């Protein structure tokens, strides 16, 4: 603050841009999202706010969106900005496929999303997207899992396991204690169980507020139903 | 205290009638090192003291060639000096390409003044903050000009700009009759310039690393001496 | 807060957007609107903010037809709502022209919500101070009820209310709504909720707007004041 | 429709020696059957020991040479007065020619100089930028006469590698004299530019003026 | 002092001439998907077989305005065209209505078209990129 | 005091007023000069007070009366730079009307056009209103003698007779008294010299001071031309 | 009040009294400039300027404080040097354009109006600032001799005698006395002598200055602007001293 | 606002046409930005029918005709060891002497080869440009570009100028880890055709007698390509493997 | 004589009373917020070395890219904001590739550095007179190591102010002060490539809070023959073990 936080183009005397930090603060208020990659899959987990009694649930949008048959995306922050970002990412994926005959790689799409977010910080007449994204998938004709995190400032990074959103510090500490990079979960079931147990550290109600999506090579994307998540939760509770 | 309320930009006058941003841009010149220029009826010379970030770094280039018959030295903001030098090169190139002419030094001074005045009356930009010394030789002989970024140009026999340039300027003014008649002897004029710029040294000595010379003349194209080429002048 | 609410493109130190919050707050000053989805139709009801008897009632301030399958209830500024309604009608006709098929409800809702979100990201634009209740039918999901707010977020509902008395109306709907409800029961429930939540002494016909989307095909019916009086007499209000 | 092209037919010849290069051209400038001038040079020193000629429509060739020389000036400004090599000049000229792909210069271009190892080098260009390095090339109206003379005189017959500058100059002069005797558009004068490690030297000889 | 518009033909072409639809994978090439022109429209086809009156009609009003400005410069001085252009720039710059295409009242007053109608007024007139955000990006140049 | 952003731009105050417009109105009285306009049977007369106290000024270059077209004359109350700006704009407008519609521009139409421009100034944030009051006089081919007035607010209206300046109230009261006595809206005279003399006498009576030939400017509009009198003409008119 | 608080931080803003304080501050900037005077004689104009003595390093013939807009128009200014140079360049452009268009030298009133419109246009928007110069210009045309003075607000007037700068009050008093004592008129050479005298009186605290005098007269310079040569300048200086 | 004044303040520059930035750049007035464009700028005549103008002025005495590439037979085929490219090397004769061997195969990069047909200048210029684009792509993505992407880039480029006058037919051959060996054919009509065996030029029918199997050794494949070229008729041979192209010569 | 707030350090186009532009100073502070990078130039090549600073162990260590290749003969190390560096690296690669396309030769290291600095100038007027492109100056500094035939091996330091220097040895980032102080004493003109690598590793170990190993540090070199190459983890680990044994 102190008069240095009223514009995107103002450096702080200690070399900070406070509006970026405030966009991160906006991101911190969204529901928690987790991404964990195993030996042969990537699992994205999301926290869902408890559905109201009169709220319809058949057409409610999911927290995990399919950018392309091999790349998926989850977010934390402002829900309305995420739709714009997802639409732009899907358009870019189709455009790249048309221009080069080849589907995008995960890193390329992450860089494009980060570029859009960076562009929306380069004018005093525009507002940055208050969204942090997790992009997961597999490169075409490849079997190495890819997981990336993108921030409102336009910075992106590559992680073995990452959390964003509300109460993400506790989930990150749990993952750091219970994840080993040299020995990742060798099966889909282990990765899903680890993701669910990480989400259970901050989800109050339990199974009904957890969404799990699994991505495998060769364009294999599966959204787990409530019954499977409930079974995982019950098994975790019994083993506890 | 009251100045603090009327120095926001270049489109604001103070209640006493002062334009403070232009004054600050002019003050920015003294943050640069000293450069000296002089001339006679046949040659014009620039002498520059260069500075380095530390012992592991190189020295800054203070003399820039604009055309085979004209060059300049700078003191002040580096980006402004870069912009103005490129602009002068473009104008000389245009003159040569379109008219097969050598651009006059006075024309270059007028163009620089016109370009610099615009930034001092409109919102959005800032005034330039570099002073320039332009030497050249054309159909009117040898010319030395001093450019101030407020949009001012003066024609002089000799001058100095930058930090502690007052001593060099006083020495040049005192010995005007000496170097005003050094015709056909470039070495004597260069030596006079070196002595003048030495008059502005403070706990420093000229070396082959921090001294730069430039000369233009009747049959001498604009030539820059650095390193060992100035060793005989030390 | 006063140093971070003059413009729509600046985040607060806590990450809040005050202009969007003020636009959301402005919705509470509008007349109540209610949408109820039954097993065989959708009912839209609304209360006018009429203060004089010199107002024409026969000739629509809360209910509009986007197309033969989709209608909306409005809570907020009327002129911004009319701008968005014309835009939605044009979009629906464009979809019909391009694909030779009726536009799905969710696509239209998402388009309008994207427009309203975009109006919160440019410094020269203020947010639309309106909330919409969309009632529609399509061959993909059947009957659908949606709500959109100034922030650009939209939600799906079975029974929903917007406007001045949203909390009490939602409480009553939660206490009274059933999944297997019929259109007539939905009409009675909406009327009773409006009567209970009204700040006026009585819920007369001239302070009401009513609409129903049902089947014989799918038919839209915007009730006339005489039909509103007849249903009010039938219910017992 | 207005026709923007013309023809000022002349003859040029470039030859690469062991450690030298030569570029020669006739100085006759003509229109149809009239003589515009009897000494109008077409071979120019472009700086950095590079000689250039663009034979054909004279205005297009003059424009191309002017653009190349201005580009060389900016190259010296932007790269600490670095010397422009002959291959880089050939690439620049290819780009300049192809920039007019849909409105081409009506010229044939030859450049000559010394390569990085000091050997003589000659580059020939098509009107839209296709270029190649060659030992010898003649262009213009009398090329089909000049080339057989050189082929009979030299083997590419003392080999070209062991010829001196004076012998090459004599061969060029003899070939141009023969072409002047046989071709109406060739005559008046011949100008030769020689590029060696010491620089560029000019020589001029008279030809038949009828 | 032109009456019929002149210098309407293009002198240079390139694959990146339209900066607003450049591909992100290959920045030197255009993005055909976001062009939304049918996908089979090379730029070269726009250089030939045009109706001869199209360029005259498209640039007519600008040509008349430029002639008026030149007359003002000749008769009144530099200040009059400077002020007219400044007023027009100020009016056009602060108008941003992504949901409308009609011109402003103040622009019509400045253009002396308060009570004038032409066919451009009568006839003022996708899958990808026809939303508010595209207009925001074009307006802000980001 | 405007007390807000209205200190600079034309936006509504909490009372519903535009302070910049009112301040331009206040600026209209800077010169401390009064002007009068009256209508004859077939002529219109405008008289403007001239104050040149400085002895170094050239009086012949001091004028607030402008010739807009062949038949239209204008008198301006306010500072001379804005007056000259408005004069050039009005000349251009009249010429453009003649070019576009094939007949000479009427005085009232020109007044309405200038009023619309002033409305633009009142509504646009980055445009300031001109601090002048304009009075156009002519003999229209359809309406006869015509006086119309426009102000910085964008308001324009026609008058039987008008007065503008710091002492306009007394002149207006005297005009109202004379018109009530005569029970007509115009001056019953056949020559414009008599109308000029009557207007001079009215100005002298209203201001309570005597005027010489150098203290006034007179403009006369007939059905043929609008023309400004010189010093000799005014001196001749004074002798009566 | 000379300081309008709350209404002086942006150009093109009206104060509650209807004043524009940025233009007034530009006037204040003008009032601190060097003293310059202009006198209108029977058939011409004379301009006089006081100069501070600078270093000997300046080239004597390349430092002229009186600008020639056109062969028949002379001009001096007080205030900001770059603003004066910009205005003189604009005036030269306007004169050249008029002469090209209508085959005659531009009349002084038309030139004055074009300059005044250009200056006034800079008091209309907040993205620019008013010029910080007051300009005294003049010349000879087919209608006779004309002398004008132009202010930062864009207001200009024709003058019998004009003065600007720090010593404007004393110069104006001397000009008023000269006008009073010569109801019939004044000649060009007498105008030169009086201009020298007025500059000397206005200067009088660092008694070291030079004097520049230019004139345009139908009888003397055939209606052309010329600087005063050595003999006449020396005579004027001697008359001013004695 | 002062920029507007400069725009309205004054002829000579207008006649020189140097008030336009493109003209200043093309003549190197303000610098060398003309030599800094990733997408080249191509001049067209400012008339209603540029295509007719070019076609009329190209199909008509001196040596200033547009050079045409050799119509000689070229063969490309793919096998388990990579790609074999064979070109009948018989240079034409003119009023010039060659300093060295003339290459009818463009080396786009140490991993990509192209074949010339139609306009020599078009092929050379656009394949050098394609090499620049591929280098930039590989720098950005930190991985070697696939043959499909490069062929598609060239195809889109030539399609943007379709009908303007370009004449070229090329074979892009490359060996990547993901795709294996790959051959595409791209011409100025915009066609982009993936294939196993390509024979282009005069005598293509005779050279299409390729005895072809996906189990040929490197020596057998080279011999088969040489024999096919000889049947079509020296021969220039190229063997493209995952590590790049190797020039044999025969 | 009263204390009042001054606001000359907020606008990038506003001068201080003494002629400073404090937004550039604050951009330099933002650079100092970054991690350490060190370059040492010898006659056998130029060595670059960076510290990999990871906030969490879950971050992929093989993902942080503070050293990039601009061209086969030009490499770069960055310190500061990553997105600004990404834009600058894209511009530098485009410049090198385009110069090769138009001149059929490698671009000089100093020419590429000048092009990057001209890009960095874009928060004001451009070097050729272009209009403003950026709202704020960059918040990242670059170390450009190259080899050309004209000037041998070169190391340049490029700043957001648009000015570059030539250095025999340079350090940027959080630990730049102590690292530069050590460089001033430990550099000489007769250093070998191996000695330069060992010195870079030693200085990185000195100014690193964490224990130096292959995971949190990265090395790279440029030589005339091999070009620009970033060392793998095994070679850096061997060099670190050798340095430990020597010390």
mmCIF file of C-alpha atoms in Angstrom, chain F residues 1-2 7-8 20 23-24 26-27 30 54-58 61-62 64 80-82 84-85 88 126 128-131, chain G residues 6-7 10 12-16 18 117 120 123-125 148 153-161 172 175-176 179-180:
data_model
loop_
_atom_site.group_PDB
_atom_site.id
_atom_site.type_symbol
_atom_site.label_atom_id
_atom_site.label_comp_id
_atom_site.label_asym_id
_atom_site.label_seq_id
_atom_site.Cartn_x
_atom_site.Cartn_y
_atom_site.Cartn_z
ATOM 1 C CA UNK F 1 -17.477 25.791 -4.795
ATOM 2 C CA UNK F 2 -18.083 22.655 -6.856
ATOM 3 C CA UNK F 7 -14.383 21.429 -10.086
ATOM 4 C CA UNK F 8 -12.955 20.370 -13.472
ATOM 5 C CA UNK F 20 -18.546 24.502 -14.990
ATOM 6 C CA UNK F 23 -18.686 29.434 -14.175
ATOM 7 C CA UNK F 24 -18.535 29.916 -17.951
ATOM 8 C CA UNK F 26 -19.728 34.125 -14.952
ATOM 9 C CA UNK F 27 -16.772 34.366 -17.344
ATOM 10 C CA UNK F 30 -15.228 39.571 -17.838
ATOM 11 C CA UNK F 54 -5.221 52.235 -22.449
ATOM 12 C CA UNK F 55 -3.662 54.977 -24.573
ATOM 13 C CA UNK F 56 -1.210 52.588 -26.265
ATOM 14 C CA UNK F 57 -3.965 50.485 -27.866
ATOM 15 C CA UNK F 58 -5.101 50.997 -31.446
ATOM 16 C CA UNK F 61 -8.462 46.856 -33.874
ATOM 17 C CA UNK F 62 -10.850 46.621 -30.891
ATOM 18 C CA UNK F 64 -16.627 42.472 -30.676
ATOM 19 C CA UNK F 80 -12.085 38.007 -27.269
ATOM 20 C CA UNK F 81 -10.201 34.689 -27.874
ATOM 21 C CA UNK F 82 -13.338 32.584 -27.414
ATOM 22 C CA UNK F 84 -12.891 34.807 -32.394
ATOM 23 C CA UNK F 85 -13.058 31.013 -32.060
ATOM 24 C CA UNK F 88 -14.649 31.297 -37.239
ATOM 25 C CA UNK F 126 -13.065 16.343 -21.900
ATOM 26 C CA UNK F 128 -14.976 22.724 -21.924
ATOM 27 C CA UNK F 129 -17.736 25.208 -22.764
ATOM 28 C CA UNK F 130 -16.781 28.535 -24.285
ATOM 29 C CA UNK F 131 -17.302 31.429 -21.902
ATOM 30 C CA UNK G 6 -8.651 23.896 -6.119
ATOM 31 C CA UNK G 7 -8.946 25.334 -9.643
ATOM 32 C CA UNK G 10 -5.450 21.544 -14.720
ATOM 33 C CA UNK G 12 -9.169 24.486 -19.409
ATOM 34 C CA UNK G 13 -10.963 24.756 -16.052
ATOM 35 C CA UNK G 14 -13.209 27.633 -14.984
ATOM 36 C CA UNK G 15 -12.986 29.006 -11.452
ATOM 37 C CA UNK G 16 -16.134 30.086 -9.565
ATOM 38 C CA UNK G 18 -14.884 32.555 -14.273
ATOM 39 C CA UNK G 117 -6.198 31.042 -32.997
ATOM 40 C CA UNK G 120 -6.063 29.965 -28.056
ATOM 41 C CA UNK G 123 -6.353 26.645 -23.611
ATOM 42 C CA UNK G 124 -9.054 24.103 -24.536
ATOM 43 C CA UNK G 125 -7.820 20.702 -23.298
ATOM 44 C CA UNK G 148 0.546 43.688 -32.513
ATOM 45 C CA UNK G 153 -4.601 33.481 -23.464
ATOM 46 C CA UNK G 154 -4.643 33.935 -27.243
ATOM 47 C CA UNK G 155 -5.819 37.533 -26.919
ATOM 48 C CA UNK G 156 -3.986 39.951 -29.208
ATOM 49 C CA UNK G 157 -4.338 43.643 -29.971
ATOM 50 C CA UNK G 158 -2.849 46.304 -32.206
ATOM 51 C CA UNK G 159 -0.707 48.868 -30.415
ATOM 52 C CA UNK G 160 0.850 52.274 -30.897
ATOM 53 C CA UNK G 161 3.571 51.089 -28.509
ATOM 54 C CA UNK G 172 5.029 51.430 -20.798
ATOM 55 C CA UNK G 175 5.872 54.751 -24.358
ATOM 56 C CA UNK G 176 2.823 56.622 -23.046
ATOM 57 C CA UNK G 179 2.733 58.996 -27.551
ATOM 58 C CA UNK G 180 1.569 62.055 -25.598
#
